[PDB]
Amino acid sequence: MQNDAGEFVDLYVPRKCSASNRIIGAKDHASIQMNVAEVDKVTGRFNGQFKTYAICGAIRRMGESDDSILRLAKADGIVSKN
Amino acid sequence: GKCRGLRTARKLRSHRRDQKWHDKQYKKAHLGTALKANPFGGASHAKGIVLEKVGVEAKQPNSAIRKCVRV
Amino acid sequence: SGALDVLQMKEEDVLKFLAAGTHLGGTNLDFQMEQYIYKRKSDGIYIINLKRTWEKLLLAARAIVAIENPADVSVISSRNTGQRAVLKFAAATGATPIAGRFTPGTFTNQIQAAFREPRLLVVTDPRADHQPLTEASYVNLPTIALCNTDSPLRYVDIAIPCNNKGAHSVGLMWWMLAREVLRMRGTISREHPWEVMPDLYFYRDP
Amino acid sequence: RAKWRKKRMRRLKRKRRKMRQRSK
Amino acid sequence: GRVRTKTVKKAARVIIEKYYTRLGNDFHTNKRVCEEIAIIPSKKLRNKIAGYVTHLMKRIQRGPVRGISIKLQEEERERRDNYVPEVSALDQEIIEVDPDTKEMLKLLDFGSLSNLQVTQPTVGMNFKTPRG
Amino acid sequence: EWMPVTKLGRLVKDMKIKSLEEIYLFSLPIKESEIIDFFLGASLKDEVLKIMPVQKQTRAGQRTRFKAFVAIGDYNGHVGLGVKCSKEVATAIRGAIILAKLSIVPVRRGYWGNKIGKPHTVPCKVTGRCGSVLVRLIPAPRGTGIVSAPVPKKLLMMAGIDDCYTSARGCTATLGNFAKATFDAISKTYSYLTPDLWKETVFTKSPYQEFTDHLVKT
Amino acid sequence: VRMNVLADALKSINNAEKRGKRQVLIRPCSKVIVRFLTVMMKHGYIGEFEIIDDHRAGKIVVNLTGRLNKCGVISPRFDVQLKDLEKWQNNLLPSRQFGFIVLTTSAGIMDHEEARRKHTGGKILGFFF
Amino acid sequence: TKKRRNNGRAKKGRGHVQPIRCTNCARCVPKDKAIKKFVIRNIVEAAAVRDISEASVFDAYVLPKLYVKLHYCVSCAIHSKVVRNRSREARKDRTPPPRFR
RNA sequence: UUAAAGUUGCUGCAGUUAAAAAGCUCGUAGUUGGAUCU
RNA sequence: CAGAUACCGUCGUAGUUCCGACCAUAAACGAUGCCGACCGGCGAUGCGGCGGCGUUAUUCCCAUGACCCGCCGGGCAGCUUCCGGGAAACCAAAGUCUUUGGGUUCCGGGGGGAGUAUGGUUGCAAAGCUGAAACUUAAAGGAAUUGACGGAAGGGCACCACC
Ligand SMILES: [Zn+2]
């Protein structure tokens, strides 16, 4: 990924699953990257910003991508406590 | 599966000794019956005297007469 | 709702949920839908937690709002009970509707007639709309689904706990999503109630 | 059938018991 | 047997979906509107299209068909779809609620609802089908 | 004249997407060969590995049809393999080349010992599996070359690998499975997690989201 | 019966991380298990863990970070001299840039590089990468 | 190669099952392998009921039935068309035939 | 005769259908053996 | 029946039954050694225990039984799954195997000759156990796929088929 001279010698840096920390390969066509919008505290309209989550095909074949995204959104404050 | 202890060397070596005899190359080389049945007796060449000229007909699908000699 | 007091669910909405029978599920429970229910009542019917339903509906609305092109979102319903509510959801927000039979190869076959490349997919039933939802695993599609207590959650990324069987419940659930999408975009005021009533989304037996 | 050949090979042995003895 | 073919059926469906306004129930008029528009070879093929057109227009009066799409029919079905009663089906003076749902609403700080009415649940716990 | 039909082709043809690794980063399926011809092009070279006749028994005799295996590579970290069956050999080869282009994957290269210069070998020992055939790749010292059979050596040279030890188990006489097992092992180099790739990922906007306005008006 | 409890400890952790789980329970606990887990943790492979007391052989709850490819035991505990370590690490480790062999020496339970620094051999407990 | 997961039987968790005789051959068949049918028929057929009630001295007499349990070997159930052959997947359908309709 | 032979397999093979788990259980030698002490 | 030393039928000896000694073999099969850990769901069933509305032993006291709804442990199994494996058929074990080590017993090494000869041993016998070689051979074999055929089962058509 880098040599002794410090130069970066990697063709590209792949993505990693937000749930299982697995590398998302170039032929993983069942992986998703999802944006969830952010709102204003007062008026409650679309601020213009979003938060991004990447889920891998193995995790969303397993049936656990619904709970994974809910956990990740709870961690970021988007979803209320319980 | 196979035993994997630290005091298993005798078991492993004896089993290998016993099971090598089921290898037909090993048995043929190390048994001694294939050395007594070899007309050359372990030599690469041998000398002999011609008794008769013979003709051996080939195995199918080939049809010919291979020309041999009895020695 | 990020614990915000403007995004909390109100009594006029809980009364709509109760009248449509949204809180009422089936006799069976999927093991990955267990966290969304409150309790099982005698006569063996599971009760869905309306607080959880509201949170998941708002998350789905956020996911929809994040799509820049309104037409990139495709909404699909196979059963007739959802066919009037997906043609009406698509007429208010601009999404692309598919009501009826889904042709296999819509998302994967690149020379067909009705070939499309959505950025987001919303379906009415995971069990009934299974072909559009598995075909989305070939082309990197996120999926939002309306889920009952017996609904599998494969290839489902946002599952909304609701009664997806009753016509009133389906129409109400599609009408609430459009309402939240419009109120999050900022085309509808959040104080005045919507002048469109849920009845426009309902299914009528001829 | 191998059952019959097994039966055949046993009659041969039973007869060779008689025709090949220690007294021979 | 007297069964049409995909050529005549396709041509007739196209004619109906493109020229709904002029076509009607009469055969001898639809026979004359087809010759004016569609470049069709001889009378025998012209008539088998214009006969299935007349047959297929009667079905439209009974309601829509799964083979054609008229935008005027789209407008009519949209007028049918834009139907809402004055009093909705979801605004009720009294809503019947089970004792178990009432506790869920209590956890939802909705214990002040005044349209609710807790009912008596069924006692016999018999909700399964007999086996065999 | 490239008239693209997918929205990835309409962004490649309009200079918006300017790298193949930009498409690889988002795992988007590539359905048009002109996208590959656009970026790699003059770098690509192909090789016909075998021509397999296959037969289908019928009432009136056999029915013969020919199968072609084609490998493709730029010798600089990209490699693909495609197979096609058709009634005529020329058509089979022409159609297999397209598939080989559409299968092109990147290859990760690493260092055996000290890290001086460009990477020359596989980053770690990797195994590929295909229908009774197992192919193992082991990193090798610089300058050793590719110690392998003639069939996987072609694909290993196409991919830019310079040094590698190889091992093979199973029926390797079926080169259709022998070539698909080494191609599988090469694909895994960008799937193996190493302490190099332990950093948190930063998410960049996808091209579909970034060129929304361009795609709407085109 | 249960022999080599550390084998069961390491097989449970490997099997859970294949499933993408965030926590694993290990029973029974043992001090060899704890030292091996600490060696794995100081290299950034598992993360914080916790021991539950039972007035018996306790148990362990381990947090998993998705950074583990394999962790395995070697049975029996072969004796390793400092001149035979290179062959072992060639046979067991996936590369010369990452991976560790865990040994027990008279200076403690460590990995194959600390053993080289301290100039000592020992007995091989296992490996992880 | 193996055709059925249950070996064509119902034997599970036991060693030996007592045999029975086929009704048609008198062939020994294991009881869990035999094809069994319970037949409840009428003594008189519909071709004779009209001639039986007119001669009956009892008003509203109900004619008796006949109860027979029949056991078949695998060969007779096939020859007598009691059991047919069916496709590989259909073989896994073990619902009784829709006769009760 | 060595490699090829991971076709003698300690590293490192196989035993449902291709060669192959003893009819079953007991039992001595052999092999292996749970926490726990600065 | 061409022939029947068979299949079909009429008799019928040993045997089939019991008591007491031998014999130690089966497609003795789940064609799958035993002990231990981890890895997905769902509904049933047999036993033991624990809890809970309500029916019934006729109108009541409690236990006790028969139903009903669940939970726990040990069993015989079943359905489903992109858990993973496999040449595949298929298997929640036949999984956790080139990312190769939990413990241990037995056993295999291309096809024949051949489970034969010979020696030993057990048995009244029949036989059981142990068990070669000379020689011969380029394949034998396992799964799955298209056809062809079936004295295998279901449908359809024809006055060059019948009615
Ligand atoms: Zn019979």
Same domain membership, residue G39 and residue G74:
no
- DSSP-derived letter for residue G51 is E
Nearest to C3 by CA among G24, A76, H51, A56: A76
The helix (run of H) or strand (run of E) holding residue F90 is: helix F89-102
From CA C46, how far away is CA C33, in angstroms rounded?
A: 11
The helix (run of H) or strand (run of E) holding residue F61 is: strand F61-73
Task: Return the half-sphere exposure (C-beta side, CA atoms, 13 A cut-off) of residue H5.
Answer: 5
Nearest to C131 by CA among C76, C90, C88: C76
Number of other residues whose CB lies within 10 A of the CB of residue C85: 28
Q: In this structure, are residues C124 and C171 in contact, taking their beta carbons and an 8 Å threshold? A: no
Residue type, C138: Y
Helices C11-19 and C167-185 meet at what angle, rounded to 10? 150
List, in order, residues 6 or more apart from F198 with CB less than 8 Å away: G44, G67
Residue G110's DSSP bridge partners are G103
Distance F142 CA to I9 C1' (A): 32
Q: Which two tokens stand for residue E46?
A: 């012209």
Task: Return the half-sphere exposure (C-beta side, CA atoms, 13 A cut-off) of residue F175.
Answer: 19
CB–CB contact C140 F216 (8 Å): no
Calculate the alpha carbon distances from E96 to C15, C48, E106, F187, F191 in Å: 11, 17, 15, 61, 57
For the domain spanning E1-61, the CATH number is 1.10.60.20
Q: Is the dihedral of CA A68, A72, A73, A74 positive or negative?
A: positive
Q: Report if CB D9 to strand J is under 7 Å.
A: yes
CB–CB contact C19 E113 (8 Å): no
CB–CB contact A59 G20 (8 Å): yes
Nearest to F28 by CA among A30, E21, H54: A30
Which residue minimizes Cα–C1' distance to J99?
G70
From CA G123, how far away is CA G128, in angstroms rounded?
A: 16
From CA G73, how far away is CA G126, in angstroms rounded?
A: 4
Nearest to A15 by CA among G34, F24, H14: F24
Same domain membership, residue G2 and residue G59:
yes
Nearest to C45 by CA among C60, C61, C28: C28
Residue whose entry in the numeric block shows the structure tokens 């991508």: A65
Calculate the alpha carbon distances from H68 to H30, H37, H41, H42, H83 in Å: 19, 8, 8, 11, 18
Pairing mode, strands C120-123 and C73-77? parallel
Nearest to G96 by CA among F151, F173, A37, F124: F124
- Report domain extents, chain C: 13-206
- Report domain extents, chain H: 1-101
Q: Report if CB H16 to strand J is under 7 Å.
A: no
Q: How far is the CA of E72 from the centre of ligand 1 (A)?
A: 71
Question: Phi, psi at residue F120, to the nearest 5°?
Answer: -130, -10
CB–CB contact F124 G44 (8 Å): no
List, in order, residues 6 or more apart from F20 with CB less than 8 Å away: F36, F39, F40, F78, F106
Residue A50's DSSP bridge partners are A37
From CA G128, how far away is CA G9, in angstroms rounded?
A: 13
From CA C2, how far away is CA E26, in angstroms rounded?
A: 66
Nearest to F36 by CA among F64, F13, F52: F13
Report helix, strand or coil for E114: coil
Q: What is the SS3 assignment for A50-67?
A: EEEEEECHHHHHCCCHHH
List, in order, residues 6 or more apart from F68 with CB less than 8 Å away: F48, F50, F51, F52, F83, F84, F85, F86, F89, F92, F93, F96
Calculate the alpha carbon distances from A80 to A49, A72, B62, C3 in Å: 19, 12, 89, 5
Q: In this structure, are residues C53 and C164 in contact, taking their beta carbons and an 8 Å threshold? A: no
Q: Which two tokens stand for residue C109?
A: 């076959």
CB–CB contact G75 B6 (8 Å): no
From CA C187, how far away is CA C60, in angstroms rounded?
A: 18
Report helix, strand or coil for G44: coil
Q: In this structure, are residues C19 and E92 in contact, taking their beta carbons and an 8 Å threshold? A: yes
Burial of C143 (0-12, 13-18, 19+ CB in 10 A): buried
Looking at the structure of chain G, the number of domains it has is: 2
Q: What's the CA angle centered on C95, arms C90 and C96, to 5 degrees? A: 90
Nucleotides of J under 7 A from a protein CB: 30-31, 33, 35-45, 52-54, 68-70, 75-80, 82-84, 86-91, 95-110, 114-118, 126-127, 133-135, 138, 142-144, 146-148, 152-154
From CA C127, how far away is CA G113, in angstroms rounded?
A: 55
Same domain membership, residue G75 and residue G38:
no
Burial of F38 (0-12, 13-18, 19+ CB in 10 A): middle
Q: How far is the CA of H31 from the centre of ligand 1 (A)?
A: 13
| Maximum pairwise Cα distance, chain F | 66
Q: Find the residue in C nearest to A81 (Cα).
A: C3
From CA H55, how far away is CA H42, in angstroms rounded?
A: 18
From CA F91, how far away is CA F83, in angstroms rounded?
A: 12
Same domain membership, residue G80 and residue G28:
no
- DSSP-derived letter for residue F196 is G
Residue whose entry in the numeric block shows the structure tokens 């294939």: B34
CB of B32 less than 8 A from some CB of G: no
Distance E121 CA to J71 C1' (A): 24
C-alpha torsion F128→F133→F135→F136, nearest 10: 90
Question: Phi, psi at residue G47, to the nearest 5°?
Answer: 105, -175
Buried b (16+ CB within 10 A) or exposed e, G22-47: eebebeebeeebbbbbebbbeeebbe
The helix (run of H) or strand (run of E) holding residue H71 is: strand H65-72
From CA A22, how far away is CA A27, in angstroms rounded?
A: 14
Transcribe A29-55 into DSSP letters: TT-EEEEEEEE-SSS--EEEEEEEEEE
Burial of F208 (0-12, 13-18, 19+ CB in 10 A): buried
Chain G residues 23-62 within 7 Å (CB) of strand I: 28-32, 56-58
From CA G65, how far away is CA G17, in angstroms rounded?
A: 9
Burial of B70 (0-12, 13-18, 19+ CB in 10 A): exposed
Burial of D1 (0-12, 13-18, 19+ CB in 10 A): exposed
List, in order, residues 6 or more apart from A32 with CB less than 8 Å away: A54, A55, A60, A65, C140, C141, C142, C157
Which residue minimizes Cα–C1' distance to I33?
G3
Parent domain of G80 = 69-129
- DSSP-derived letter for residue C171 is H
List, in order, residues 6 or more apart from E130 with CB less than 8 Å away: none
Q: What's the CA angle centered on B51, arms B49 and B54, to 5 degrees? A: 125
**Experimental structure resolution, Å:** 2.9
Burial of C203 (0-12, 13-18, 19+ CB in 10 A): middle
From CA C139, how far away is CA C147, in angstroms rounded?
A: 23
Calculate the alpha carbon distances from A36 to A46, A54, A75, C2, C189 in Å: 10, 11, 13, 12, 22
Q: In this structure, are residues H24 and H76 in contact, taking their beta carbons and an 8 Å threshold? A: yes
Q: Report if CB F131 to strand J is under 7 Å.
A: yes
The helix (run of H) or strand (run of E) holding residue C53 is: helix C50-65
Which nucleotide does the CA of B38 lie closest to, via C1'?
Answer: J134
From CA C96, how far away is CA C75, in angstroms rounded?
A: 6
